[PDB]
Symmetry: C3
Subunit: 106 residues, 3 copies
């Protein structure tokens, strides 16, 4: 999918997690977010389509998704353990990473 | 190692996992696959040798291995928990990613 | 932060882990190492400032941190399970990657 579609997936599933009641919903949502973040890594944001995909900004863009992926990893492990409230708290910490990339490249 | 040898390692250890009896065999094989996937990420596949190193195709190639590595991650955790058949099923799900990359770059 | 600051964080926290007596010391140190390794991925080392940003050497540099991150991952899970000596042995295994990257690019 393209970048905006992956962002919609990330946003949709983050809201599923906030409102979630059971670990299965959270595990499923974080799994879709992991796939969306990996797919987004291969995109070029519109404010960067004017650089080499190897520019330092583009590498900063892709590493931003690696940072997001390690945070999703921590949350998905909590969801796998059934720690539903802790997983929701780890998922809320994602938005710092969301906000930092948006400030630079959105 | 070269890309050919890493692909041999991936394929051979995938077979080892299918025939495995115990979790230590699955854990050992998956750990070798993780190392091979990381090493493969450094390669330029023959289909892309005559394109720019800064091409979006090279980025998509490397992200293909990130996708594989996160699926290897899930299987390896199952093996570390002693869940042999679940780890084996998670490893069989690698083949979707193997083939998706092959359709593009093999 | 710049590359040298990230290296100082990696080096300082590896020493903390070697001297740690409890799992919380190790968990906190590895968590800072993970953040530093991800940040270092954005850098261009002085020895490679003359290379194209997507050159095989720059790719090798960035994948070296991916290798480091998966080893940090294993050590951090062991620390989270309270296996302190095991987590310390896993962190000692990081040095092979530190030394291999320095041999090539420092
Ligand atoms: C960079 C590393 C990013 C991270 C991490 C996240 N987002 Fe993002 N997002 C990014 C860009 C460059 C853009 C602009 C895309 C464009 O074509 O304009 C976006 C966009 C969004 C949007 C709006 C989508 C749209 O249709 O316009 C949303 C709702 C969004 N992003 C949400 C979001 C969430 C919830 C994130 C973390 C969980 C997140 N983004 C991370 C770049 C990056
Ligand atoms: C891209 C991101 C790939 C992923 C994921 C996997 N493979 Fe692959 N493979 C890829 C390429 C570009 C090539 C051609 C290499 C060449 O030099 O020709 C291959 C090749 C193979 C082969 C046969 C080639 C050989 O080793 O001589 C096998 C058996 C193979 N690949 C297996 C394999 C498996 C089992 C994978 C998933 C677990 C897998 N590959 C993923 C690119 C990519
Ligand atoms: C490449 C993939 C590297 C890995 C993995 C590690 N390091 Fe590193 N380190 C790297 C470079 C290119 C440099 C040179 C930076 C420069 O500007 O000269 C370094 C440097 C260091 C230093 C010295 C920092 C300074 O004050 O100049 C230290 C103390 C250091 N690195 C430690 C270190 C440790 C402990 C690592 C593993 C945990 C490690 N590095 C990995 C490249 C890479
Ligand atoms: Fe994990």
């Amino acid at each position: 999918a393209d970048l905006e579609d992956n962002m919609e997936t990330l946003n949709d599933n983050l809201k599923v997690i906030e409102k979630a009641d059971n670990a299965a919903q959270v595990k499923d949502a974080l799994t879709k977010m992991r796939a969306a973040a990996l797919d987004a890594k291969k995109a070029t944001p519109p404010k960067l389509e004017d650089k080499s995909p190897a520019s330092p900004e583009m590498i900063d863009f892709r590493v931003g998704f690696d940072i997001l992926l390690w945070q999703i990893h921590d949350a998905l492990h909590l969801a796998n353990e059934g720690k539903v409230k802790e997983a929701q708290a780890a998922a809320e910490q994602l938005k710092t990473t969301c906000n930092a990339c948006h400030q630079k490249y959105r």
